[PDB]
Amino acid sequence: MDVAGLTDCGLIRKSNQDAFYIDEKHQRFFIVADGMGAGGEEASRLAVDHIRQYLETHLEDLQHDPVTLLRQAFLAANHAIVEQQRQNSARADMGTTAVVILLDEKGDRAWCAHVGDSRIYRWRKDQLQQITSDHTWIAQAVQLGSLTIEQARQHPWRHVLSQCLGREDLSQIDIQPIDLEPGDRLLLCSDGLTEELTDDVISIYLSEPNVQKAAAALVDAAKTHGGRDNVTVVVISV
Ligand SMILES: [Ca+2]
Ligand SMILES: [Ca+2]
Ligand SMILES: [Ca+2]
Ligand SMILES: [Ca+2]
């Protein structure tokens, strides 16, 4: 199992409010976060650090129930952000997305958890499947529907989140298992990737067996197409 990760300002933004973490020691979990609000940079850093620390501490005890483990990790992160909101008034609106992959000990089942509009994709025998459903008002519209015209981007938002970490009224944390097969790739990415690259283009770059090149190619391609935002990817080869 190989894994690569990469973040980039893009072409327009002056700072990077994304963050990510790869468990390089044991390759059990992987995190991407897309902050908003300077920062923004603080929210996404808090999310990544607290989810990581929570998982590091509680993985041995709770890996049998990863839904509880991941929910408690996200809430740990959420409160750490709110507590830094409750305190600091300038950074009172700060927030972030998060997407997390937690692998089971065996390595053939990946628990996918997210809040926001960063994505987890799985790639398998040239088929790219988006796993997570965007917490945006526009996505959940189409996902009923109607407004099924897509069509969806661009509207006013488009960019507006229906869920993010850093809100006291955080109820929805989406967690779902996916089964893994040798040869799969997992992609975690901020919307800076998917706002520039169609799913067809992404699938092309995830066909590259060398995950370092794949990740580098994905970021390079997102800048070529415009790079209007921070862009972060973690590419896992199963
Ligand atoms: Ca952002
Ligand atoms: Ca967006
Ligand atoms: Ca973004
Ligand atoms: Ca473009």
Cβ density class 35-73: b for 16+ within 10 Å, e for less: bbbebbbbbbbbbbbbbbebbeeebeebbeebeebbebb
How many helices and strands, by DSSP H and E, does the chain display? 6, 11
Give the residue ranges of the annotated binding site: 34-35, 117, 181, 191, 195-196, 225, 229
Residue 99: partners with Cβ closer than 8 Å, 6 or more residues away: 31, 32, 33, 112, 113, 114, 116, 118, 119, 120, 132, 188, 189
- Cα-to-chain-centroid distance, residue 69: 17
Instruction: Return d(Cα 116, Cα 174) in angstroms, integer.
Output: 10
Distance (Å) from CA 2 to ligand 4 centroid:
30
Distance (Å) from CA 75 to ligand 1 centroid:
20
The resolution of the experimental structure, rounded to one decimal in Å, is 2.0
Give the residue ranges of the annotated binding site for Ca(2+): 34-35, 117, 191, 196, 225, 229
Q: What is the CATH number of the domain that holds 148?
A: 3.60.40.10
Place of tokens 């960019």: 159
Q: How many domains are there within the chain?
A: 1
Instruction: Return d(Cα 123, Cα 236) in angstroms, integer.
Output: 10
| Amino acid in the structure at residue 44 | S
Half-sphere exposure at residue 166, Cβ-oriented, CA atoms within 13 angstroms: 31
DSSP letters for 64-132: TSHHHHHHHHHHHHHHHHHHHHHH-SGGGS-EE-EEEEEE-TTSSEEEEEEESS-EEEEEETTEEEE-S
User: Rounded to the nearest 5°, which phi and psi values hold at 218?
Assistant: -60, -50
Q: The domain containing residue 30 runs over which residues?
A: 1-238
**Of the bound ligands, which one is closest to the alpha carbon of residue 222?**
4
Determination approach:
X-ray
Query: Within 10 A of 184 (CB to CB), how many other CB atoms are there?
Result: 18
Distance (Å) from CA 42 to ligand 4 centroid:
27
Quick one: which of 118, 113, 158 has its CA closest to 140? 158
**Of the bound ligands, which one is closest to the alpha carbon of residue 18?**
1
Distance (Å) from CA 198 to ligand 4 centroid:
10
Q: For Cα atoms 191, 215, 221, give the angle at the middle one, nearest 5 degrees.
A: 65
User: Rounded to the nearest 5°, which phi and psi values hold at 60?
Assistant: -55, -45
Distance (Å) from CA 169 to ligand 1 centroid:
20
